[PDB]
Each structure stands twice: as structure tokens, then as C-alpha cells.
Amino acid sequence: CCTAKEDVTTLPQIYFKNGEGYDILVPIGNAHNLISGTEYLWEHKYYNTFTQKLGGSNPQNCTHACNKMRGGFKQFNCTPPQVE
């Protein structure tokens, strides 16, 4: 079941240095991080955070986690302090 698939379409593509050259790099999301972050920051009540529902109004499209956890995946609120 666990194999590979490659579609850089719609996928951010950034350069990152290899030390003496560059390496064009595609950042994709982590599945363990998303579901584990939702469960843990809900069960230890972390509230300086966001909520994002992946898929839109039909969350059966993206993944199976999307389809089940339709309440919304939780993202960290990475807002810095503001002066004055």
C-alpha cells in the first residue's frame, strides 16, 4: 500500500543552498504533524493557535484525515509581539 507518487503541480518550489550550490526544494506537509498536533493541542488545551479546514466545503477530496476531522486542522498562531 505504501508507495510513491510525484506531482509538483501546485506545489511551492523554493531554492535552498547545499553549501556550495543550490538545491531546488518542494516543501510538502506532514501528516503525523497535522493530526498529532490537532489531538495534542486539543488535549493539552493550547489556545494560542489557529484553525484551518482543508478541502473547503467538501473535505472528502483532499485526504481521509480531512474527511474525518471536519472540525478543522489546528495551526500555530505565529504572531510576534507588536511595539507601542
Place this chain on the structure above:
DNA sequence: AGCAATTTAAATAGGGAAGATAAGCAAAGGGTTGACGAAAGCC
């Protein structure tokens, strides 16, 4: 048409009252934002 002096000390204490209450309603909308995959005309 500028000159106006210096030190010295500024009150110790005791009191700042409790008893009551601090409304009950009813409202808080849904409308878009669906991709993959499969019939089915169409170059």
C-alpha cells in the same frame, strides 16, 4: 538704572461603622467557495 542677607525648625495620636440588594425576557441567519472520475458529443 542695579542693589532685596543669612540659620532654625514645620506635631506627636486616635478613629476611618456595618446591613440590604446587584432582574427577569428574547433574539445570535444562511447564501459561494467539489476533484476525481466517468458518460458522451466532438475534433
